Design a protein around this ligand. Sequence first.
Ligand SMILES: CCCc1c([S@](=O)C2CCCCC2)c2cc(Cl)ccc2[nH]c1=O
Lengths: 517, 400
Amino acid sequence: PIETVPVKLKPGMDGPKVKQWPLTEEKIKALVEICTEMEKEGKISKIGPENPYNTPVFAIKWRKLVDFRELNKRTQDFWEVQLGIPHPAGLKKKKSVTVLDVGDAYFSVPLDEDFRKYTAFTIPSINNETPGIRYQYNVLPQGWKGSPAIFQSSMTKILEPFRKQNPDIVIYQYMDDLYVGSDLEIGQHRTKIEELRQHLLRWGLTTPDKKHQKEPPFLWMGYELHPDKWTVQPIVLPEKDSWTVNDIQKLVGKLNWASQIYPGIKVRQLCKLLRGTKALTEVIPLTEEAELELAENREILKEPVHGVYYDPSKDLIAEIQKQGQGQWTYQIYQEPFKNLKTGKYARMRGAHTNDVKQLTEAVQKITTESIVIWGKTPKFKLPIQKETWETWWTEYWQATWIPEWEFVNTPPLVKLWYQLEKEPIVGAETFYVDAGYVTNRGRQKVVTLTDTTNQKTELQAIYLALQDSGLEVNIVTDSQYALGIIQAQPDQSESELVNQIIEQLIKKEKVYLAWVP
Amino acid sequence: TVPVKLKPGMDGPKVKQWPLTEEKIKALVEICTEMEKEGKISKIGPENPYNTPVFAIKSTKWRKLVDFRELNKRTQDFWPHPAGLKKKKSVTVLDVGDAYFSVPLDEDFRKYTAFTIPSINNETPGIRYQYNVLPQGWKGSPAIFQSSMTKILEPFRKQNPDIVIYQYMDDLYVGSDLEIGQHRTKIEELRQHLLRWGLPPFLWMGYELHPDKWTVQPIVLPEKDSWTVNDIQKLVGKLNWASQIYPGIKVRQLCKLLRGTKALTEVIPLTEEAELELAENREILKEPVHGVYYDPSKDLIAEIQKQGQGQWTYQIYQEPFKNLKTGKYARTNDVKQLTEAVQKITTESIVIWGKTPKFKLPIQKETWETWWTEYWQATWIPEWEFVNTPPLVKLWYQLE
Ligand SMILES: CCCc1c([S@](=O)C2CCCCC2)c2cc(Cl)ccc2[nH]c1=O
């Protein structure tokens, strides 16, 4: 049998001494049936008065179900399973893939002797004056905190040898599922799949027969895995006449899932229906653009599109396009426009920003993703020119770096709509702003702002200045704030004011912004 | 094994492992597989919940680098720094981490040194290990091996008392004033003398630091032929700021040349009053502010500003405006330069105060977390937080 993992209760705490709820004599008789069997098999062992501990059992034909919450609150933490699942695009193509279900795996694995006592439960005796039978697990109790970690860990040492012996086969463990894959001629694959099952047998683990097995396509967590290709499960858009805030939020939800394989799915219009909504049941009439959006998505979705597997041998290419303002669509492929995956990116970091800046982040998101999925960073193809980047690059206070990339004259091309003069412009009128301004040529304008905030009045003055000034202007402000924002050279902002300035700025011939105490 | 414990009440670290590039992972597999055969480390089971992050840095050989920062913070203190070493002409840095790989680690602290070699696309559980010997990078190692170390060196120390030898973590700093040629010959004697005892590569290209030449990059004011309204406004701006440091700085006279809303480009002739005030301001600025002393009981902070063109400005202080040191660094790409800087600045802090400072980095975390280990070469890791450099603080620290 497999060596045992030593468990312990959390520091200080003591075993589960919880009372066994009353049990219907009809349930009591069915438990004795079940337990006796488990004992006959080695999983549990009758114990005595010695052990004070106890953990509630009840019946759910008839099946056993032990409540380990308390023990689970009292059991040490374990290096948990993984939470990080593989992503189809990361998988390599395979000829055959057999998935085996390790039936009662936790049950064919030993439990640390010194811990067995803490798993102590009790089957009440039918009649009043006579006491019932008391047990404790010899194996991994299903429902216990450390069973998955200890099962998997063990399953791994068991599989390690066989693994190092059969390098042409790869194995992925996932709960009770054992997925075996290879590029062997089906025949040898089915025989291998059968030695495996015999090596696991040489260790107590029992797998199903070739007749009860499972093969592609697999329907795993919103996906459809074929041996050579993958995709997301079939997705159908309703055709309602009446959409609720709830129906819409779920649609927007499934539409995002698709983003990973279907290029160009859009949810702007839809998401906008959720504005001001007052209840999860509130009906929202579809706007003209939302229907247009829904129709497009419906089409895109009608086409079945699959993603291919990772070819460790070929390079990764990530391509990024501006799908709109704040929106970017990318696709990672090894073979010419033959996707492994694709995706979007709306993320706006900071109230203000520019496509150059925003594109650069898209690159970082995509870079981190790749490292997680394929273990390497792709060669990027971006709609931006080296000199444009290099220009916003060295002039920005923050440090930043884009991997290896090549320009791709694929409109629209990210650009800079304006750049402040590095030196005060000669001959250009000069404005001193504060809600108003005063210029070197005697001009001035005061305006009484309503509802504004301190900082918002600052941007206003400036805006007011840009407004009345000519093509070339010089502005002096004290707002370190307005200064930073504008010095960061934004082209898009959540703020409307800032947006008007950005327009003013784009229209000017030359603008010099200066700060003073 | 000297029995060690975590500070009272503190549990072991449970730090997430940042994703690694398949290359780094492979390097880590080769290395850990070998340390395993050599019994320095051992695979562990699921009953160990702790984790410390690992990295592979870069000879063609790869160096494993465990980020024991969190663990060292929860690691009991143990119960000095040669102010002279900073004065020596040349300082060489030796990596003596291997001296540890031969001292068992208290059987019970082992669980705390757990680390994980990750897997690509989560296709495998990840290889889990823990140390059996003193791990490099752990705060406890230098201490526990201190004894055995002092022995090994007492000879050389006495044989070459003209030589200052400071150890810090996995690093040894050999300092002297000898000519460059004798220094390098002298170092090599130490290498074979550290070898005589047991397993020492050079650090920093086997090249030497010349702390003797390090110096405060003071604040400077624009010295120009003609002065426009803009120059002055910027001048007053920079001056007025620095006034919160040197209060003897006066702006009254320059601020008079700026009465009335004029045109930024208009050239203003400096009145003698203003002429001499600027003069006094330049002098006061000629040197670091008096009364700034290094408190050994406060955190050492280092802020770096990107000045563009491959130039960065930094300052080391414990109390705002009270800089203990300020400098510049010049070339690559933003990230590479940024990390080179961080390591330069640490090396000094150590050499000077034998303590690493806490950095405030002008970079996006995901970015830094993604490329730092591509250019990193030290065996230690400072504490670092990510910030947003104010537009004017960079303007008040640029050039000549
Ligand atoms: C076992 C190695 C992982 C692997 C699989 S696993 O079955 C797949 C692992 C994720 C969870 C469910 C199934 C795989 C499955 C299909 Cl259908 C096609 C290509 C594949 N290529 C691969 O590298």
